[PDB]
Amino acid sequence: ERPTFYRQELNKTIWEVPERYQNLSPVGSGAYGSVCAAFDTKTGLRVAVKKLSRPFQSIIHAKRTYRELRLLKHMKHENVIGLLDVFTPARSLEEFNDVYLVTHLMGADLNNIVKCQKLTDDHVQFLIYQILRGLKYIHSADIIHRDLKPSNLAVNEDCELKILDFGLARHTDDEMTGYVATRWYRAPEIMLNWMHYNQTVDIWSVGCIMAELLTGRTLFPGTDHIDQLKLILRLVGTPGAELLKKISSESARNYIQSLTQMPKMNFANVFIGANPLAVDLLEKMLVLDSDKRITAAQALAHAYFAQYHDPDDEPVADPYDQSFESRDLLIDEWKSLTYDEVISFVPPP
Ligand SMILES: Cc1ccc(C(=O)NC2CC2)cc1-c1ccn2c(C(C)(C)C)nnc2c1
Numbered sequence: 380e381r382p383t384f385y386r387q388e389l390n391k392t393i394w395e396v397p398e399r400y401q402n403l404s405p406v407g408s409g410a411y412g413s414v415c416a417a418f419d420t421k422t423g424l425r426v427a428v429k430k431l432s433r434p435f436q437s438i439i440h441a442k443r444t445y446r447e448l449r450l451l452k453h454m455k456h457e458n459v460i461g462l463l464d465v466f467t468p469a470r471s472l473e474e475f476n477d478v479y480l481v482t483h484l485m486g487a488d489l490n491n492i493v494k495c496q497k498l499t500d501d502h503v504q505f506l507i508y509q510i511l512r513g514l515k516y517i518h519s520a521d522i523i524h525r526d527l528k529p530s531n532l533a534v535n536e537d538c539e540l541k542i543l544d545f546g547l548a549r550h551t552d553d554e555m556t557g558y559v560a561t562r563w564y565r566a567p568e569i570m571l572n573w574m575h576y577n578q579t580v581d582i583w584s585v586g587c588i589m590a591e592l593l594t595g596r597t598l599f600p601g602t603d604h605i606d607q608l609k610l611i612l613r614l615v616g617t618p619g620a621e622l623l624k625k626i627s628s629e630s631a632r633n634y635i636q637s638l639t640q641m642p643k644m645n646f647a648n649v650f651i652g653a654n655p656l657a658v659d660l661l662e663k664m665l666v667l668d669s670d671k672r673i674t675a676a677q678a679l680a681h682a683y684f685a686q687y688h689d690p691d692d693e694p695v696a697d698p699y700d701q702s703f704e705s706r707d708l709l710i711d712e713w714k715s716l717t718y719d720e721v722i723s724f725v726p727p728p
Contacts, residue, residue, distance in 0.1 A: 465724050520699040
């Protein structure tokens with residue numbers, strides 16, 4: 380009872396997918412893999428199907444395919460994308476060469492819904508509640524998103540949200556360059572490599588996202604890493620002695636110490652007219668010192684989310700074994716591990 384596969388030409392590439400998936404149509408390539416929307420006739424869901432992609436052409440590609448599949452199989456939370464299905468047209472490990480991952484398709488991304496557009500306060504509470512609820516879960520598994528931004532927040536018509544692309548974060552020097560949304564939401568310590576960083580890199584990005592939902596404008600649209608740092612330091616202040624010490628990169632501590640000291644601005648004068656509770660929570664997320672930033676779990680308990688908070692309905696993850704991250708294997712070994720993961724996949728209920 381291996382399903383029946385059929386073949387389509389799409390992206391100018393062959394898709395070979397089980398007959399359960401019908402009406403495939405492109406919703407974009409990437410480098411990465413191609414994504415298609417599809418109707419899953421078995422679940423009644425609209426789904427996103429990602430074909431990787433030369434998955435085992437280098438060690439870097441093989442480890443990455445294994446990582447993504449492992450991450451997706453782990454995640455079981457309403458506000459985190461998980462795996463609905465994984466499949467290969469291949470019948471043996473020897474023939475194994477393509478992986479397709481299937482995922483709920485919420486509908487759009489947040490970026491395409493909200494940008495240039497200011498949201499109502501109740502709409503903001505809901506979206507950020509769900510981002511922190513799914514981040515509490517991800518972080519509890521010891522996973523860092525590292526690249527949270529509106530384009531990887533999948534949102535449906537009812538403003539319900541799942542987080543995409545956690546744990547992968549492997550951008551080139553060039554995708555991060557100049558006046559680009561790829562960098563606007565990243566934590567200063569990660570943008571400028573100040574230190575080996577914690578999970579609160581992600582709470583900095585929620586803060587950037589939240590401020591943009593409230594105001595309709597990017598919070599730190601820097602034209603480059605240094606311009607963006609200056610936008611940052613102008614709002615939150617230059618570091619103190621105490622943070623300067625923790626900046627293990629000697630090079631970066633020397634640069635930042637060159638800067639004219641500036642105090643933290645008043646967030647109620649930047650976020651004029653906003654819910655005081657929204658402003659308070661922004662001041663707790665946008666703290667420069669990552670050791671002092673609010674965590675997803677503490678933030679969910681904040682008064683801003685009184686309507687939505689239910690401490691009994693904010694679950695945590697079973698633990699995630701990333702011991703494989705510090706293992707060097709050969710192509711065929713990553714590939715065989717990936718295959719074991721493809722074949723033991725048990726669909727959700
Ligand atoms: C198919 C797929 C596979 C894995 C991951 C993924 O997140 N992998 C990393 C966590 C390990 C994301 C998607 C995916 C891709 C685009 N999507 C959209 C658009 C088309 C609206 C952007 N909405 N939902 C999605 C979901």
